[model samples]
Target: RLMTRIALDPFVRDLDGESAALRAAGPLAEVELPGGVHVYAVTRHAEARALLTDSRVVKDIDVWNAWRRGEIPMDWPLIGLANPGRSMLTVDGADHRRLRTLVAQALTVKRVERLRAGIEALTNASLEKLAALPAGEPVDLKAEFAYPLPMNVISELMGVDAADHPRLKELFEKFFSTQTPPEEVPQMMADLGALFTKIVDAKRTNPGDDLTSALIAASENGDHLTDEEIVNTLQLIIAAGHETTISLIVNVVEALQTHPEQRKKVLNGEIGWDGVIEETLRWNTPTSHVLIRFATEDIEVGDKILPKGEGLIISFGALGRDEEQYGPTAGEFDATRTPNRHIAFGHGPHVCPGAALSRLEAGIALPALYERFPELDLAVPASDLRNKPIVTQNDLHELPVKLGCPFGG
Candidate 1:
């Protein structure tokens, strides 16, 4: 059997091309992520959905044969993601529910709805900041617009201090970068853990009306989250909360800019913001690839077999364009894509609990952004834009745009 070893190198300049190659490789494609570590990816939407729901595929890192054999190194750049310790992401069964339930309850639709006012307030404040940024100069919409809203919102929700934002941003840069030197990997991991632990400890001493404080309180109740579980869950939520929403906001702007016809209709209110967001999530999803799930036994995906104890990754980027699922027009970005049921967040029990929050953030931010700067256009050509080297995230380095003026005046 010839394995199509797709190299997820840092210079993955052509993500769609890579996605095309994977889909062509059949449902399951062998992937070589960064350091020559081998894993398989499910490239078709149907196969991915089936496997994600399949109980035979579990989240235990020790279940991976390579991990068990010590073939995976500690300094590997993705080690922290693959073995992030005792969090909901790395567990299954009752343990998974025990760890995930508290966080899930907090981010429920009714619960997250309460934050809409705060999100809208944050969006307006962020827009005001953008409005003041040296008028007539090119702006990196990502930093001014996309970056701050989600970061500020998530930080407020988690009870993290404003001072801590700069530091977490620095650590996450290293955390996501494949180019982050192997020698520094351990230290970066330690730094991330230390900061989250410190945040957790802060909550322990002085409880606030925040998720971290809630987790701490739950631990004292029958919920019984270990200090380790409490801390790691905080790390997971804080990590998951911002990045996806940030990228979603950025990608939607990029999509509209590249498609002027769609942009015109969007501005004219012929199409809704919800359509714009859902299409972007499918077309250029934030989390391109989710890392590392192990097969408990041999599992069949289409014509391919993911062997027992082997590791698997879900290529949302690839499946997002699966012609089998979306027909031949899958590659095209259509704002009016009806019945557009794309699982960009994920599927099954592990589907993103924060999906509603991410959508709400975008719903508030993008409409507010376009309304504030209806004449906003990309400062650089779409072709000139480049994605950062983090294979897991489909994020641009920056979205350069020239803000014409306020919507009126």
Candidate 2:
């Protein structure tokens, strides 16, 4: 068995470009593990997705007794937490399908649509707050707009008390932030456990109109959901909700400012209700990478036969940029473009359940933002935009701009 640290580094270094590069690297690539476990990596999008939804390629560590017996050293544990050996993103077979189905009801199109008007109200209020910032000052777009908007909207979805927002934020910081050290993961998990336990207890006594209440009722009524499943599903909801969309909004806004023509199209006509949202998803694609899949059986891709149990990392970010799929200029932001089959929400059975709510929130917020301030520009140089060392796909740490005719109307 062979493992190379430098080889794995490429996946992390050019993660945004990794998928297409995988095609270049051939269908089957090797990553050498520490204790001589030679693992293969896959990059082709079509084949990659197959491995993800395949029942033969289980996401659990026990699937390969060789690696578990300490005879092979694999980085499987390295991806153990967020993509944990146990997660909706990792599991396979009936349990994976069932868990996803149970959570799907909460994130349904109608369920998310019900929150649209309120989300718009939140967006408008955020804009107002941004405008109120001291004039001529560069306000961190993240602090004033990007971060809070999604957080607030998601909080409302989960029935969290407004007062608990701060605690909720802290809990997320500990539980979900990839920047947080892995060693601290236990504490983070503990924090999430404690917090959700309290929330679950509350809903048990007094069910409300929110998703948590609905899910609790579903579980209690023998709706194929257990209490533990409810908690885990809600955790998935809260974690995925703000993190990816927060980055999506930030990245798209930043992209618009940097690309003037694109910004003009959005502000002028191309972007309306769904157009802007779709364009943003196509262009930025906040959720950059999916799980590392292993070939279940010998399969030929790019003329390479990946032996069973070989690992493959899929990159949606690169897939979105594929000129073949969207056009020769697919990477460009054209809000009005049709036939947009971008996989920003991914495809197949594991497609993002939050698609409706995310689109709704961003559609309302971004358009209103540009309408309120068409002259929006990045307060910093293009070089300073969030990239490198950060390793985050979407993050607008700060976006300071002069809004609405600085001298006042």
Candidate 3:
């Protein structure tokens, strides 16, 4: 019997609708990636959680039969993502532990807590910029506000120079897009490596009190991380660090603006920003689909078997709103939803090390945004908002909003 082949759309024109379709396909769905690569997606929350922790599922790219057989080409649009260098993302066992431990140490909740003052100052500075805009003018809040805060915060944390931001943004947009032409894939990948390698080389000579410097110091002291590991790790953290929180802040604003009663309650102090942030994460996740975990053996997922050597992708957008897990209300966006345990950051040993830091940045930025512009609202209708053509990231092209007069002004 032929399996149901779900064709994953390239543009993700309707993310919520696509997620609903994935959920309907059941816990494990046989799916086609944008470039026609076949993979299985775990759609249900319980199954995703189980698989993320399952030892049979590994991150080693060599386990992918298609890639090994040379069927998965270097020029494949998603080549960079599927075979992104030897960072913690691609390793397993001792290597994963070693690489993750270094990152975890820097991004521990306590260490991340120390960044609050810096984040707050950044948030206030961003708010001040928005306030200085002509009152009642339409603004792309995403470009002007949401994008910069996390980018700046993560850059500072990683010691990335401001001069690199524009180049990073250009390359990353291509990096995340399924739409990049096949021919450009190799150069784009090279440029990213070169840029990050340059950053690491500079950090080596002029070491500072930053994560990159610390990672360099650790390698010298005994971690034994190669230059390749350091460069790829830097790219991974910088990409993951800013991207998730940027979406979180944007999604929270989108959610509140679309639901006025909830917005009112939030601004009125009846609902906490934590609830707002958590619900938006579940209801409209930042990451739509995480790519390419390989099955070491024929792993049973519900009644279906994820065949050995087959690739598996996690449909976080679908799993986030699982009816079985969150009950009937899973589809709804409720800021006050109790026990809101959504793994937007991910789960198990490979969970995002920067989770606390992402939360810290969002926690500071969101409330301050609304507080400064109490009458802030969407410039365009909610339906007018469009997503970028990036399968992994559920990011908006822009978030146009009307900035009302500052509270004091």
lDDT of 1 by residue, 1-409 (tens): 6365989857669988888898888689988888888999998899999999999999988789999998899999888778888888888899888888888999899999999999999899999899888999899999888888898899899899899989998888888888899999999989999999998988899999998888888764885789898888878877754578888998999899999999999988999999999999998899989987999999988777999999999999889987888888999999999988899989998999999888889999998988989899999999988988888888889899998899661
**What are the RMSD figures for all models against the true structure?**
1.2, 4.0, 1.4
> Candidate 3 lDDT, tens digit per residue, 34-70?
8888889999999999999999999988898888887
User: Between prediction 2 and prediction 3, which has the larger TM-score?
Assistant: 3
Ranking by TM-score: 1, 3, 2
Over 4 Å off, model 2: 1-20, 26-42, 64-90, 174-179, 271-273, 292-295, 388-392, 404-409
Report clash pairs, candidate 2. Answer: 2-32, 3-32, 3-33, 4-32, 42-312, 80-84, 141-399
Work out the TM-score per prediction.
0.98, 0.84, 0.97
* Candidate models: Cα lDDT each: 0.88, 0.64, 0.88
In angstroms, how far off is 108's CA in candidate 1?
1.5
Evaluated at residue 71, the lDDT of candidate 2 is: 59
Residue ranges of candidate 1 with Cα displaced over 4 Å:
none
Model 2 / residue 36 / CA error / Å: 12
